[PDB]
Amino acid sequence: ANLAPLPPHVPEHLVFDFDMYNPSNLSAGVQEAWAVLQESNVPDLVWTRCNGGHWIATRGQLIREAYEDYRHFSSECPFIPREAGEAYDFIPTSMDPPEQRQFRALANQVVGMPVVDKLENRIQELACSLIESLRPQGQCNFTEDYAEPFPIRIFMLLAGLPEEDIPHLKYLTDQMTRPDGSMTFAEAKEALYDYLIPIIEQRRQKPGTDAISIVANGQVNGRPITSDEAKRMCGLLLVGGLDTVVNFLSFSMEFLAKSPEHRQELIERPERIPAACEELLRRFSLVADGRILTSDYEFHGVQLKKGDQILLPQMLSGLDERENACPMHVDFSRQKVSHTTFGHGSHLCLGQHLARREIIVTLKEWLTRIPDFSIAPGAQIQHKSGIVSGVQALPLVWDPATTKAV
């Protein structure tokens, strides 16, 4: 690990060199690896010298606070490392209130609740189709066989982009959240923009009903959105569509593959599925971005300097034992599932309704046709960490004789 020189204003007792891109205890699971930050030996707000050096709030209370106080904690540079957060210019995520407001409203028009209600039939259709297709095989590589195609095809459908462009696009979005060293954030971002530019141009000329057309021809601040602003909002839609639900689905199915009574519980009481979805969202939270200090500020006894970056792991809030008792235990009956999995503050996830729909549909439709399954014998499941964490591969196996078509 390459630790950056401790800045003079950071007390040595607050140092804890956690690498968000390669946590030390990753072998135990990614959420577990991040949960080490919540052990008794770690202060509530620490400084890691990894990835250029930055703060990390480890408690739900501080994460919520920082997310609410955009005045001190700006989204202008929300990604670690520094180079990534600076090149990051997505709309509305790189803006603080009140600017983000008009732009957030437009994005909502395209991925909001009404749109989800409108596409529910296609969502239901694809889920059933993909699963019925896998059902008689008795095995599947969940990440590539379902986790990826289900949410991504729905997104490409919503955006009016050919499914043929998925491989190319997914490689680029993944470079921004889980860098493999092949390219800088800026380069992955530019390439993604190169893809969108002609499409936006074209859809501004001849408007459609797809998400890209709606955004490109939308109104913000009483005037027409610019091509640049359109490109920046669409870049974000792509990332959210291709690299969020995709990863989350695999953590959930990995858990279900190892939990027969949890499976059977949803099978008998499908009305519990929405709660189970919420609990899985808490237990398998997977996003971690942050903010930048707009000025010198003392936060909970810690002196933060202007320009200091602070990671505010959305993932940690619900795993915080102060927020949920026995945080690592999955309990579908939890009277209160506290979490910030979809974020907190003015930038609360707009695609959260689409995400829950996809999750709930997956849970019901999978358990219906394939009620009994397990991880392939031998298989060693590996997780990966970054702005969005995921599962490398998820080999599942089952006896076709136990499955049932609908």
Ligand X SMILES: CC1(C)[C@@H]2CC[C@@]1(C)C(=O)C2
Q: Which residues are catalytic?
A: 178, 243-244, 349-351
Q: Which window, 11-19, 122-130, 265-273, 350-358, contacts ligand HEM (CB under 6 A)?
A: 350-358
How many residues contact ligand HEM, by CB under 6 A?
A: 27
* Contact by Cβ (8 Å): 193, 231: yes
75 interacts with, out of ligand HEM, K ion, ligand X, none, CB within 5 to 8 A per kind: ligand HEM
Helix (H) or strand (E) holding 30: helix 30-35
Q: Does 213 bind ligand X (CB under 6 A)?
A: no
Q: Does 311 bind ligand X (CB under 6 A)?
A: no
For the stretch 290-321, what's the b/e string if a residue is b when 16 or more beta carbons lie within 10 angstroms of its beta carbon?
bbbbbeebebeebebeeebbbbbbbbbbbbbe
Is the Cβ of residue 134 or residue 239 nearer to ligand X in the bound state? 239
Q: Residue with structure tokens 């189970």?
A: 276
Residue 296 Cβ vs ligand HEM, minimum distance, rounded to whole Å: 23
Tokens of 161: 């982009």
Q: Does 309 bind ligand X (CB under 6 A)?
A: no
Q: Does 248 bind ligand HEM (CB under 6 A)?
A: yes
Tokens of 400: 């076709």
CA 290 and chain centroid, separation: 13
Residue 393 Cβ vs ligand HEM, minimum distance, rounded to whole Å: 19
Using CB under 6 A, which residues numbered 160 to 189 contact ligand X?
177
Helix (H) or strand (E) holding 140: strand 139-141
CA 198 and chain centroid, separation: 27
Residue 306 Cβ vs ligand HEM, minimum distance, rounded to whole Å: 20
Helix 227-242 × helix 100-111 angle, to 10°: 50
Using CA atoms, how far apart are residues 150 and 177, in angstroms rounded to an integer? Answer: 20
Does the annotation place 349 within a ligand binding site? yes
Question: Which residue stretches of 144-226 are H helix?
Answer: 149-159, 166-177, 185-205, 211-216
350 interacts with, out of K ion, ligand HEM, ligand X, none, CB within 5 to 8 A per kind: ligand HEM
355 interacts with, out of ligand X, K ion, ligand HEM, none, CB within 5 to 8 A per kind: ligand HEM
Q: Which window, 86-94, 147-155, 198-206, 212-220, contacts K ion (CB under 5 A)?
A: 86-94
Q: Residue with structure tokens 């609740």?
A: 113
* Contact by Cβ (8 Å): 192, 226: no
177 interacts with, out of K ion, ligand HEM, ligand X, none, CB within 5 to 8 A per kind: ligand X
3 state SS for 275-341: HHHHHHHHHCCCECEEEEECCCEEECCEEECCCCEEEECHHHHCCCCCCCCCCCCCCCCCCCCCCCC
Measured from the Cβ of residue 149, the count of other Cβ atoms closer than 10 Å reads: 17
Q: Does 287 bind ligand X (CB under 6 A)?
A: yes
Ranked by CB distance to ligand X, the top (closest) residue is 240
Q: Does 388 bind ligand X (CB under 6 A)?
A: yes
**From the list 51, 58, 93, 385, which residue makes contact with ligand X (rule: CB under 6 A)?**
93
Q: Does 58 bind ligand X (CB under 6 A)?
A: no
3 state SS for 311-327: EECHHHHCCCCCCCCCC
387 interacts with, out of ligand HEM, K ion, ligand X, none, CB within 5 to 8 A per kind: ligand X
**From the list 53, 60, 240, 390, which residue makes contact with ligand X (rule: CB under 6 A)?**
240
**From the list 56, 57, 80, 111, which residue makes contact with ligand HEM (rule: CB under 6 A)?**
111
Q: Does 254 bind ligand HEM (CB under 6 A)?
A: no
* Contact by Cβ (8 Å): 215, 225: yes
Q: Does 239 bind ligand X (CB under 6 A)?
A: yes
**From the list 29, 60, 85, 92, which residue makes contact with ligand HEM (rule: CB under 6 A)?**
92
For the stretch 132-144, what's the b/e string if a residue is b when 16 or more beta carbons lie within 10 angstroms of its beta carbon?
eebbeebebebbe
Terminal alpha carbon distance of the chain: 52
Is the Cβ of residue 242 or residue 337 nearer to ligand X in the bound state? 242
Q: Does 280 bind ligand X (CB under 6 A)?
A: no
* Contact by Cβ (8 Å): 216, 205: no
Q: Residue positions in the annotated binding site?
A: 349
The residues that touch ligand HEM, with contacts defined as CB under 6 A, are 75, 78, 92-93, 100, 104, 107, 111, 236-237, 240-241, 244-245, 248, 287, 289, 314, 341-343, 347, 349-351, 354-355
Please enumerate, by residue number, every residue annotated as part of a binding site for heme: 349
Residues that bind ligand X (CB under 6 A): 90, 93, 177, 236, 239-240, 244, 287, 289, 387-388
